[PDB]
Design a protein around this ligand. Structure first.
Ligand SMILES: O=c1ccn([C@@H]2O[C@H](COP(=O)(O)OP(=O)(O)O[C@H]3O[C@H](CO)[C@@H](O)[C@H](O)[C@H]3O)[C@@H](O)[C@H]2O)c(=O)[nH]1
Length: 440
């Protein structure tokens, strides 16, 4: 019935939640138009045959794919410029066909979208694609409410409300003073998103109330949040895994962006060879425009390790992480992977790299209690050697608190599944958002 337009920044980290939310809304019986820049839509339309220029009927609703014309930080202003003109182009064609948009939902890395929305008098909504503690970090940074590291004091602790104390290198690294050249682009977009929050009536977050309970209430009277996660639940690999014994495979994957250093890759392989543990390891091939090059393994690696180890280029990570044969998840602690691990009951080994990964790894290890810390990310600037890698793999699988960390994980999978059930907090939140879309 209701035409709700969704628009994502390019990239797995942003498209996966927007699309997951799109499927949620369509299931709730709405016309949902997902939109992403064409240069990126090109790459998911080649790999997908059901991204097929018809609505995919979901529940009582449907999902049409109207990619914004990319005409393609130099890119950031280009996407803004092109987009601020071509977006209303799409809201005229749509309106003048009897189906006009009643809400635009964007993610932070296109923070100008709310402006365009309010320019046309369309209500603007924000899908936050990180944790509520990541939101709270940015909100308090932008509004200058709590003290943060400065060039004058690069190592300052930070005390945010209803959060553990974070060390200088546990707050999302986009807020760190020492920021490389391109990293400034995303920094401003996050801060630009904090600015336009005034122009937004609802902030949706892929978290569940039990996971970040006290922070969500604190923000409910400051900058209210709507937890509607885990979105992925609300909305050769397997057979090989089907042939292992339960709780025995080390699964390793660092998402679609992180490309570790060769030296770091080598210490992981020797680590896995040494302790002779079963593993599934995603080693992402690079972009064919070099930039950074394909990794290599030790010689005879695959043949020394044998049936115990398996290297793939990409993985059905949702299917993998629900698999009883997994023992742990060496993760870069992206939020989409952190939520997948939490809602599947998987213990983690944290190797965060940049952005909010350091925060999420702080929480998984010290707050959520579901894993072991392996590294501290980019400000640490240290090749984690094979011996501590072997060390954390034994702590998380057979150490003293291994079963305790397992129990913790199970209870978070229990609590994640309550929230997504028909009457749970997140299902209710999501319906009350649908309840508010209609009423206005
Ligand atoms: O082999 C793989 C590896 C990953 N995934 C999927 O890829 C996504 C990974 O997302 P995430 O865990 O969020 O990793 P990144 O792509 O690095 O996410 C980026 O965007 C997120 C939202 O801004 C931030 O939390 C991260 O810091 C940023 O790196 C998840 O849906 C995984 O299931 C696969 O299907 N197969």
């Amino acid at each position: 019935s209701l035409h709700v337009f969704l628009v994502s920044a390019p990239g797995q980290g942003n498209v996966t939640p927007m699309l997951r939310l799109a499927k949620s809304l369509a299931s709730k019986g709405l016309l949902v138009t997902f939109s992403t820049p064409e240069s990126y839509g090109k790459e998911m339309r080649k790999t997908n045959d059901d991204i097929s220029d018809q609505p995919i009927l979901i529940g009582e609703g449907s999902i049409r794919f109207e990619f914004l014309d990319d005409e393609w930080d130099a890119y950031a202003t280009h996407l803004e410029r092109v987009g601020k003109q071509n977006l209303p182009r799409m809201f005229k064609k749509h309106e003048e066909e009897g189906r006009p948009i009643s809400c635009i939902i964007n993610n932070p890395f296109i923070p100008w979208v709310p402006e365009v929305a309010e320019s046309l008098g369309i209500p603007s909504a924000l899908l936050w694609v990180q944790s509520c503690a990541s939101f709270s970090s940015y909100y308090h940074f932008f509004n200058d409410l709590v003290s943060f590291p400065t060039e004058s004091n690069l190592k300052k602790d930070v005390c945010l409300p209803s959060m553990p104390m974070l060390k200088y290198d546990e707050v999302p690294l986009l807020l760190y003073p020492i920021v490389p050249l391109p990293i400034i682009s995303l920094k401003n977009a996050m801060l630009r998103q904090q600015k336009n929050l005034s122009k937004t009536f609802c902030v949706l977050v892929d978290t569940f109330q039990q996971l970040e309970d006290e922070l969500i209430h604190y923000l409910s009277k400051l900058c209210p949040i709507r937890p509607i996660g885990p979105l992925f639940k609300i909305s050769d690999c397997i057979e090989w895994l089907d042939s292992k014994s339960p709780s025995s495979v080390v699964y390793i994957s660092f998402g679609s962006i992180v490309h570790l250093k060769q030296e770091q890759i080598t210490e992981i392989a020797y680590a896995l060879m040494n302790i002779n543990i079963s593993f599934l390891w995603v080693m992402k091939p690079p972009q064919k425009d070099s930039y950074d090059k394909q990794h290599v393994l030790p010689q005879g690696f695959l043949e020394k390790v044998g049936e115990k180890g398996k290297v793939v280029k990409w993985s059905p990570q949702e299917q993998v992480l629900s698999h009883q044969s997994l023992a742990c998840f060496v993760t870069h602690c992206g939020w989409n992977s952190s939520m997948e691990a939490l809602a599947n009951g998987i213990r983690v080994v944290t190797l965060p790299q940049w952005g909010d990964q350091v925060t999420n790894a702080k929480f998984l290890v010290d707050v959520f209690g579901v894993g072991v810390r392996l590294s501290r990310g980019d400000l640490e600037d240290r090749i984690i050697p094979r011996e501590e890698i072997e060390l954390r793999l034994l702590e998380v699988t057979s150490g003293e608190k291994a079963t305790e960390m397992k129990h913790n994980a199970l209870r978070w999978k229990k609590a994640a599944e309550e929230a997504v059930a028909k009457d749970g907090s997140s299902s209710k939140n999501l319906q009350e958002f649908v309840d508010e879309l209609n009423n206005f």
